[PDB]
Structure 1
């Protein structure tokens, strides 16, 4: 019933994405970033993170990294699945991404899962070791949903990131644009 209900949730999001994110315009594209960043901000506000990095990667992938605890990876009684999998398969960003990847740094271990339109492509796997904690989310917006544009506007992101750093003092929030490897821009914000 768990896994069935995941799939039904993906279907509902992809059928009426504007009910979930406001629109499928440029504004809705950018909302995908805000949904992921808000999760990292909550982790900071809970006392566990103080650095968030947003990268616009080649081909308009987005990478969001925080230094929080890492999304949990323990197996749930309820879903029988790792917690990160449950959390990300109920994410609107995941449903509305043609591809999404997570890397969790937790328990001295690096865990990885990938998804397409929210569907896990393989079981969560240990891929390496670490002495840090935190979460990396990378996603590519689905052009089947975002039919006007899939290209992010640096100044739109910059504006709101600076605002979020001013509101959430003590969190360092960095924006980087790597889409043109010959001219990389980086703004980083850290209030008091």
Structure 2
């Protein structure tokens, strides 16, 4: 943290398009959910509950530690006020975005935002309007010391959005995706407009996912799974297979359950680790095959969980953390190598297909 920066929310209000997808409030919902997900990945939360109200407001609630309320000695303001009313950034050297900016973006772009925090046996409540605090942080009730979490309700400001109606189908798709990638999590959704409720919880995580999305035949017939590989503090889940029917193609990547549509170091890690294992298997067992060839017919889902994710690109949709490439590549190389060794009939066919890709 060589440079640390704190500003007001005016930049967000001036160019909402640089901080959110303004077609509807779905991206704002994703931002709040990403912050509760960080509690789940830290080990402190297991439940995220989403409510869509008839007044078009959205509420997200978790059972995490509860957003901090302590008065910051310098800024003279509770943690929750500081987090909500200011844009926080920093980095190693001087240089918006759809990720890595913070929940104050949601505050900036809402007419109203309420927060209830359960922490230390206290229920705290605070209110904001248009990104400014309008009701003081106050204790409104007591709870047991172990009854904890954060609940945020917000009313997107029509001034900044094409439509303030939440896109139900896209939200359900996003929730299902997150639940698939995180067996510690149960997500509940209540749509008060449609009168529907869903609950997701995937005990088996990604198992069967590619099978469901693809068939078409794949190699391996059973897509290859990497289950909760870790090196201490970073974690990797993945599934991949080759498919010669490019009718349907799945190539999805995430960091901390956040979709990374511009890929990044985790995807590069996967590509390299795969090429490394294919190259070593060909050599250990026998044209010029490249990483592009071994990657060309691959379908995958790759999900890394890391402590301080960094985003790059103008939209901040690409994971940039440099040490991730290495972490993923070694894991993939080693685990796939073991599988190829145990599965020579399918291994041979995978090699043949790749070598056919390379021949043009």
Q: Same fold (TM over 0.5)?
A: yes
For 1:189 and 1:50, the matched residues in 2 are separated by 12
Partner of 2:57: 61
* Partner SS, residue 123 of structure 1: strand
Q: Which has the higher contact order (CA 8 A, sep 6+)?
A: 1
1:15-57 deviation per Cα after TM superposition (whole angstroms, max 9, x unaligned): 0111112x3213xx21000000000000000000000001001
Pairing of 1:1-40 with structure 2 (within 5 A): 9-21=8-20, 23-26=21-24, 29-40=25-36
Larger radius of gyration: 2
* Partner SS, residue 197 of structure 2: strand
Paired residue total: 180
- 1:52 counterpart = 2:48: yes
Please list every run of 5 or more consecutive structure 2 residues that lacks an aligned counterpart in the other structure: 87-103, 204-360
1:82-124 deviation per Cα after TM superposition (whole angstroms, max 9, x unaligned): 0011111131000000100000000111001100111000221
1:128-161 deviation per Cα after TM superposition (whole angstroms, max 9, x unaligned): 1112100000000000111x21011221111110
* Partner SS, residue 72 of structure 2: coil
Partner of 1:173: 187
Report how far residue 78 of structure 1 moved: 2.0
- 1:119 counterpart = 2:132: yes
Partner of 2:177: 163
Please list every run of 5 or more consecutive structure 1 residues that lacks an aligned counterpart in the other structure: none
* Partner SS, residue 121 of structure 1: strand
Partner of 1:106: 119
- 1:145 counterpart = 2:145: no
For 2:26 and 2:111, the matched residues in 1 are separated by 15
* Partner SS, residue 168 of structure 1: coil
Partner of 1:189: 200
For 2:62 and 2:74, the matched residues in 1 are separated by 27
TM-score, normalised to structure 2's length? 0.49
Partner of 2:150: 135
Runs of 4+ in 1 over 6 A off after TM superposition: none
Partner of 2:94: none
For 1:53 and 1:157, the matched residues in 2 are separated by 13
Partner of 2:216: none
For 1:156 and 1:20, the matched residues in 2 are separated by 19
TM-score, normalised to structure 1's length? 0.90
Please tell me the root mean square deviation across aligned C-alpha atoms, in Å.
1.3
